[PDB]
Design a protein around this nucleic acid. Sequence first.
DNA 1: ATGTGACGCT
DNA 2: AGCGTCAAC
Length: 424
Amino acid sequence: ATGQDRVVALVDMDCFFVQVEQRQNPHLRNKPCAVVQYKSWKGGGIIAVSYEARAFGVTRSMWADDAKKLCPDLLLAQVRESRGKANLTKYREASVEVMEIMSRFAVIERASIDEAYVDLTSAVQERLQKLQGQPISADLLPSTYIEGLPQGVQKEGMRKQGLFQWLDSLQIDNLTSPDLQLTVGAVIVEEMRAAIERETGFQCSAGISHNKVLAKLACGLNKPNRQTLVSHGSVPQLFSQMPIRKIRSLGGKLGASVIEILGIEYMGELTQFTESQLQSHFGEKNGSWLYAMCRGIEHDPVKPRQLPKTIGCSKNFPGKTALATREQVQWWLLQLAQELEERLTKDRNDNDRVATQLVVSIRVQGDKRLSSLRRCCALTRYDAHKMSHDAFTVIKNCNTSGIQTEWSPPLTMLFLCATKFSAS
DNA sequence: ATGTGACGCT
DNA sequence: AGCGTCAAC
Ligand SMILES: Nc1ccn([C@H]2C[C@H](O)[C@@H](COP(=O)(O)OP(=O)(O)OP(=O)(O)O)O2)c(=O)n1
Ligand SMILES: [Ca+2]
Ligand SMILES: [Ca+2]
């Protein structure tokens, strides 16, 4: 029951939006800086932070004005605003630059604007057949950390010794050795990271392991500009002090009630329990999933899908700004449907496909829920006016208000989303 | 007053 | 289908 069949990697760009602005504006390079959204309210909402600024305590979600109190020198780049809304086109375009390069090595699954998983298994099998049965130089792994090593004098010093203990203990003439494969994946990943920095100027970190979750957790262990190998063997130690919240899926309510119901804190504590025990507690899927996972075993595959499955535009209208006339509602529906049209037209022309379903969603004041009503709609032509008129229609009936020019509760949110794509 | 996109459940 | 969860996009 190995869980060592695959070789999987998660690459994720270091402070991505910041790096995109720093490439464009050299003055921002090597400085405490952040990317900000909407400068009016409290200086703007910060959404990405360079590591220099992080050392001052500046975080995401922090108000730029508040960030400047921790960090007086903090430089700010501003998100482009089209049609009264934050537009992300520059980062989406920077994303496909990375995603394309990365595709040259293996098939990837776009996990976000910023990161992608890679199944390296096949590419690893092939590279061994040139290295018959030649070793692996530390020189081939210049930015790789081996989690748990060394065991048994300053930062880069220690990385080095861990790598050497790992390479020395390595069974090279055996080509089905899981640990050897991970090492081969790591060398490949060194290369794809060098290709990314060369051809884009962006730096990233990577995690190399046997499945998606380990890969991902491995990736954050040595950030930035570094990659980390997490082998099957290293899992009991890593997990034994690993807060459960840190594993992907378990950072919300399910994870919070793993802790609750079981009276544990770390992932390794899950091993005590039988698969049936966990199934009774969390469901059949969640029981099986946790039983394997706490032993470093996970089987979610790397889906072959480089591009998003939905395209969507939303805007919030908090408190005072909530929409209360219907001319107001119609105007933003149009703005949204406009950004959407252009994103969609680009998509049919770039990625050879058409969306067929339009999802409209809203929020009303006095409702803490993330939404308040989603309705679907046909999407027969990529016309902004039609879509905004159709979106209205599917929500026109959402009017508590008697007087026919005002809007019921004022609306806290509008969301338009293209979906159900088909080949063109 | 922080402001995309995937998938699970029923 | 419409709602919820998750992480982070
Ligand atoms: N809540 C969030 C999270 C992220 N992003 C955007 C800004 C980020 O730069 C990018 C990638 O998100 P990450 O969570 O990977 O964080 P960074 O890449 O900014 O930094 P790190 O080096 O910690 O990954 O997506 C955002 O707008 N809102
Ligand atoms: Ca990142
Ligand atoms: Ca990321």
